[PDB]
Design a protein around this ligand. Structure first.
Ligand SMILES: Nc1[nH]c(=O)nc2c1ncn2[C@@H]1O[C@H](COP(=O)(O)OP(=O)(O)OP(=O)(O)O)[C@@H](O)[C@H]1O
Ligand SMILES: [Mg+2]
Ligand SMILES: [Zn+2]
Lengths: 71, 867, 162, 49
DNA sequence: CTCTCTCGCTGACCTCTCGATG
RNA sequence: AUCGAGAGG
DNA sequence: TCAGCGAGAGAG
């Protein structure tokens, strides 16, 4: 997440979709109001989202399933 | 809310429907009282209010009156921005042609009809528009098309143009103007000055000219003047209109106060200063800054140094928000006052609001995509920007007075794009070839080269050491030399088939400096990669090998450590330059005297006729060239090796430690050709036309030139400087054309399925197919034995395997042989050179290709004067 | 040699590449132009991969004749006609220089942006053309997301709704 | 950052409020160009349908 | 049918200081 | 605003 | 100015 983002690219699949997934996740924390799945460690929402993606807790299918569950 | 743009000719009804007001005969703004004239070019009724929600007379000044026209003024109450929108019209008193449809290379208003341009132009200039309009309106397109088709390289164009009029829904008689549109007023404003006078645009003059001449035609019709006077005025109006539309098509250019041509409407949309190239393909932006650049040798590869005076201004809204959040201010002016007064609490907010926010840095000539890059700021004192030493070559940057610009991303998507696409830790390979772009140079090369050399009978030679740390202790204590030859116990690691690391320990013959340098090499690399003297190529090869084997993350650390060590050890050596380092061979005088004697003796064969008058020239040239080569060889043989050193009693020879020789041999700055000019002979010069001057320059730069030699040497210098100065435009124009031709080619598919390809022959074969896909059946050289399966990507291992068996030639897929329409497919392209894997979908390859071709010609330009 | 040699190779100046294509196939002209350009570029020690020249060459040859029309349109029409078991069409490929290839495109906004605004605008107004905004320059001028990179997927939605 | 009169104000207010999002519109230079071309007697317009 | 020969028409990155004229 | 003159990368 | 190209008259 910091210095290098190569870890998350190999998990999402390509660079152009990682940006969209990370932005969608980060807007939830910044404005919507949600809690991180990882320790905050004094980071900005973009870096927290990248860390969550790197761990394996966030991708498109999970967000879609959660949105369906909410409604 | 839209998906297309339509263009077509206009009609008088459409123009009348656009307008908000009738014709406008009066002229101007009534300079005395600034309120505009009624029914004029500037008119409140036709175009709108001069002030927001206020009438011209002033009777109504409230929002409650919105939508009410004035009875005494006739002015509606509305927002004043409508003055940018509403248009007007002028009623011409006689038909006038359109200069665009008359004057062109394929003239249109004269191709529907048979006659050529000369006679029709004679008719229009009264030597009449009514006749041409009647001829155009009194034609049948369908019957003419049928006759022409039945009759049948000169009629096909007429048939096509007639069919175009039939299909397009236009009328051939609409090419003759009847009503003139009038542009909105705020797009041609009147600008006040400090003095009483005003500054006006060129359009307001041409409108007034056309209006006055058209009104002059009006009076003649009422007075029933003879047609002789009338025919003169009709020629006048068509001369005025042609000035307003496109001035200078038929040379009659109209000027103003100065002797400079006025600018027409067609001049504001075309050219390098038109709307397209100056306001729509580029513009000026907010949140930007500019400054001079210095060097920062302590930074990490992803960092940059930013002044805090610039940072405070660049991030103002973020600071305002963070101030309002904590309650330190309530209104929007308290925060502004706090920031202006520069309190002690804003310097911590600013530190909090830049913690992980990247910025973009750009240098002015942007030749390829590596001219803009993203970094993380570090707040510094001063007014200059600090830049990492390892990113200069990609920018073509220096520290001689250069400048740079900085931009700030705003939205979350922009920040993530900057971090994931443009950050300098993602750009380590070139997109035009495969080789890396971050490479050490100069001081780093010199330092590593100095550490890794060896000497004879140095201090501490012949010891047996337990490891690199003992070597560092011995060097720091002053008990051993950096160049001593010793035995050291070394442990190294190698990867197995499953990818695990296996260790191996032994004793090796090496030097103290190499053992010291071994401590920064990552695990998984052999010891032989540093057991030699290092130059530019060796260091670049080390970096490439590390990237190939281990990956991306270790490579950044390795590069930073290399730079730190090179800077650290270059300073400790004390390398300098002096006049005694430029050694001149002792046999130069004899060689020069012998050459002079030879050329003097060859003149005896010319005083008494024995050789052609054009034959002594070549002989003299060859003699002088041979003498130059002899002198150069003697100098370089004397410089490269000079030891005469004592080894345990005896005398021995070894490579030299001359400063200039070390600088040239390490690959830091020097060249073998320039040492010749420093300490050999400058050589043969050339005349401005290109011929060779008969006698050469026999002096180097250590012993100075005289007046004649110095005067001769200036021709080439000026010629090179002029060449550099006067042909950057050729490269710029070529690059622009290349970009424009191929700007809309994108990878839009995954597999075309076609079987075609091209056959590649050896330039080695490996360098010509690394990163392609096998088009057709290719097998091992043995019969019925297959080496590589079809449709495979050839990486390093595959290339090594095929080079082991000496593969003759391979067939691969190409972009040009693809059946995909509107784009190309991934497999026909192949590898993406900037990453290593296969190409992804949605990448603009046309712009990349155009930049890759264009850039080297430009860089070739401005380096001519160095020689 | 030099810069003018390169600037003349890309505009198909007559001394032939035309006959090379018309007699031995485009597969031969590709290699011919690649070799000729790399001959100029390899004297100075410049390394450029061969893909980019191939891209420019493919963009150079884009029209066809059987007046003059677009190659892809002819291919699509032939596929449609052969889908019904009918007689297709036969065509001969063309080749133009980059300056002429740029001014002959289906979009008039980009052509007007390039150069020679008056001629392009006059022809467009005479014919009554439409612009579908399918390139990078058109979306830049209007102010939308370009159909590449992180915006590519976006445009894919629009086609799904049409 | 240039030519969008409503977008610039909305972006400024959003940044002050702590929300990093934009609502783009249409640049003004395109409108100026459309009016200028219409002043030459040529009909150019956007097809909403 | 088919080479000569005139003759126009369009084209050739970023930043800073001064004055004279609108 | 346009024109002329000079300077830097 | 210089280079490049097409449209238009010629003399066979
Ligand atoms: N007319 C011009 N058009 C253009 O488009 N770019 C230009 C330019 N003039 C200078 N540059 C830029 O400046 C760099 C060399 O100028 P310079 O800073 O002195 O470094 P140089 O390598 O010459 O070595 P030095 O003089 O210090 O000994 C050059 O590449 C380029 O980017
Ligand atoms: Mg410089
Ligand atoms: Zn009133």
């Amino acid at each position: 997440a910091r210095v290098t983002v190569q870890d998350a690219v190999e998990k999402i699949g390509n660079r152009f979709d990682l940006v969209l997934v990370a932005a969608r996740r980060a807007r939830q924390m910044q404005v919507g109001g949600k809690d991180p799945l990882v320790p905050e460690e004094n980071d900005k929402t973009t870096v927290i989202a990248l860390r969550e993606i790197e761990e394996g807790l966030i991708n498109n299918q999970i967000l879609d399933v959660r949105e369906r569950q909410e409604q | 809310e839209f998906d297309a743009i339509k263009i077509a000719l206009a009609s008088p009804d459409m123009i009348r429907s656009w307008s908000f007001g009738e014709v406008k005969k009066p002229e101007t703004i009534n300079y005395r009282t600034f309120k505009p004239e009624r029914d004029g070019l500037f008119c409140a009724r036709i175009f709108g209010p001069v002030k927001d929600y206020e009438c011209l007379c002033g009777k109504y000044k409230r929002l409650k009156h919105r939508g009410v026209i004035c009875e005494k003024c006739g002015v509606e109450v509305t927002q004043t921005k409508v003055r940018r929108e509403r248009m007007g019209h002028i009623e011409l008193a006689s038909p006038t042609a359109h200069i665009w449809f008359l004057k062109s290379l394929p003239s249109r208003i004269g191709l529907l009809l048979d006659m050529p341009l000369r006679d029709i132009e004679r008719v229009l200039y009264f030597e009449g528009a009514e006749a041409i309009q009647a001829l155009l309106k009194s034609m049948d397109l369908e019957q003419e098309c049928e006759q022409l088709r039945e009759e049948l390289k000169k009629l096909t164009k007429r048939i096509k143009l007639l069919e175009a009029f039939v299909q397009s829904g236009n009328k051939p008689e609409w090419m003759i103007l009847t009503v003139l549109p009038v542009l909105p007023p705020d797009l041609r404003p009147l600008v006040p000055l400090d003095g009483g006078r005003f500054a006006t645009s060129d359009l307001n003059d041409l409108y007034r000219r056309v209006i006055n001449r058209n009104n002059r035609l009006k009076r003649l019709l009422d007075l029933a003047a003879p047609d002789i006077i009338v025919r003169n005025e009709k020629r006048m109006l068509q001369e005025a209109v042609d000035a307003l539309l496109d001035n200078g098509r038929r040379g009659r250019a109209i000027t103003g106060s100065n002797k400079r041509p006025l600018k027409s409407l067609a001049d504001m949309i075309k050219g390098k200063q038109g709307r397209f190239r100056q306001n729509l393909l580029g513009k000026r932006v907010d949140y930007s800054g500019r400054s001079v650049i210095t060097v920062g040798p302590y930074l990490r590869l992803h960092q940059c140094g930013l002044p805090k005076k610039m940072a405070l201004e660049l991030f103002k809204p973020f600071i305002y928000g963070k101030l309002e959040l904590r309650g330190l201010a309530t209104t929007i002016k308290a925060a502004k006052k706090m920031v202006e007064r520069e309190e002690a609490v804003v310097w911590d907010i600013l530190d909090e609001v830049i913690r992980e926010h990247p910025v973009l840095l750009n240098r002015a000539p942007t030749l390829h995509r590596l001219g803009i890059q993203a970094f993380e700021p570090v707040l510094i004192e001063g007014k200059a920007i600090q830049l990492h030493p390892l990113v200069c070559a990609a920018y073509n940057a220096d520290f001689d007075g250069d400048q740079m610009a900085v931009h700030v991303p705003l939205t979350l998507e922009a920040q993530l794009e900057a971090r994931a696409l443009m950050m300098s830790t993602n750009n380590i390979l070139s997109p035009a070839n495969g080789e890396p772009i971050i490479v050490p140079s100069q001081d780093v090369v010199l330092g590593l080269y100095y550490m890794t050399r060896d000497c004879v009978n140095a201090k501490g030679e012949g010891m047996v050491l337990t490891g690199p740390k003992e070597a560092e202790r011995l060097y720091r204590s002053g008990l051993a030399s950096l160049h001593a030859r010793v035995k050291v116990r070394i442990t190294e690691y190698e990867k197995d088939a499953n990818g695990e690391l296996v260790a191996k320990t032994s004793l090796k013959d090496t030097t103290v400096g190499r053992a010291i340098l071994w401590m920064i090499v990552p695990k998984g690399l052999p010891y032989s990669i540093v057991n030699q003297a290092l130059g530019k190529k060796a260091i670049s090869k080390m970096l490439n090998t590390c990237y190939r084997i281990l990956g991306l993350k270790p490579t950044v650390i390795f590069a930073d450590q290399i730079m730190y060590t090179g800077f650290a050890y270059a300073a400790r050596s004390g390398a300098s330059v002096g006049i005694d380092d430029m050694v001149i061979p002792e046999k130069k005088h004899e060689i020069i005297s012998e050459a002079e004697a030879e050329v003097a003796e060859i003149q005896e064969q010319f005083q008494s006729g024995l050789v052609t008058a054009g034959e002594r020239y070549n002989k003299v040239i060859d003699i002088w060239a041979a003498a130059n080569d002899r002198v150069s060889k003697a100098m370089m043989d004397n410089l490269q090796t000079e030891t005469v050193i004592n080894r345990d009693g005896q005398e021995e020879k070894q490579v030299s430690f001359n400063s200039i020789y070390m600088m040239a041999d390490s690959g830091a700055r020097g060249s073998a050709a320039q040492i010749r000019q420093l300490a050999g002979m400058r050589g043969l010069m050339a005349k401005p036309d290109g011929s060779i001057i008969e006698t050469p320059i026999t002096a180097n730069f250590r012993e100075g030139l005289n007046v004649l030699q110095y005067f001769i040497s200036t021709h080439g210098a000026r010629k090179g400087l002029a060449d550099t100065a006067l042909k950057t435009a050729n490269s710029g124009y070529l690059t622009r054309r290349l970009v424009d031709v191929a700007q809309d080619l994108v990878v839009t598919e995954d597999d075309c399925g076609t079987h075609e390809g091209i056959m590649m022959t050896p330039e080695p074969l490996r360098d010509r197919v690394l990163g392609r896909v096998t088009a057709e059946d290719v097998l091992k050289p043995g019969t019925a034995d297959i080496l590589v399966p079809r449709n495979t990507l050839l990486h390093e291992q595959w290339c090594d395997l095929l080079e082991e068996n000496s593969v003759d030639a391979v067939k691969v897929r190409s972009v040009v042989s693809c059946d995909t329409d509107f784009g190309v497919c991934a497999h026909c392209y192949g590898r993406d050179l900037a990453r290593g894997h296969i190409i992804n979908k949605g990448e603009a390859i046309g712009v990349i290709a155009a930049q890759s071709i264009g850039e080297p010609g430009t860089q070739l330009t401005m380096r001519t004067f160095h020689i | 040699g030099g810069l003018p040699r390169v600037a003349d190779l890309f505009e198909a100046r007559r001394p032939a590449p035309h006959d090379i294509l018309r007699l031995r196939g485009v597969h031969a002209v590709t290699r011919y132009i690649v070799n000729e350009v790399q001959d100029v570029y390899r004297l100075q020690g410049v390394k450029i991969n061969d893909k980019h020249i191939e891209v420019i060459v493919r963009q150079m040859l884009r029209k066809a004749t059987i007046e003059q029309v677009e190659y892809s349109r002819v291919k699509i029409a032939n596929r449609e006609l052969e889908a019904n078991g009918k007689v297709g069409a036969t065509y001969s490929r063309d080749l133009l220089g980059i300056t002429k290839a740029s001014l002959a495109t289906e979009s008039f906004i980009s052509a007007a942006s390039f150069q020679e605004t008056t001629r392009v605008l006059t022809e467009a107004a005479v014919a009554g053309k439409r612009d579908e905004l399918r390139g990078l320059k058109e979306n830049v001028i209007v102010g939308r997301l370009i159909p590449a990179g992180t915006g590519y997927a976006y445009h894919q939605d629009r086609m799904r709704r049409r | 950052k240039s030519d969008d009169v409503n977008g610039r104000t909305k972006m400024y207010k959003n940044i002050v409020d702590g929300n990093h999002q934009m609502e783009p519109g249409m640049p003004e230079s395109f409108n100026v160009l459309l009016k200028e071309i219409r002043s030459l007697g040529i009909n150019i317009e956007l097809e909403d349908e």
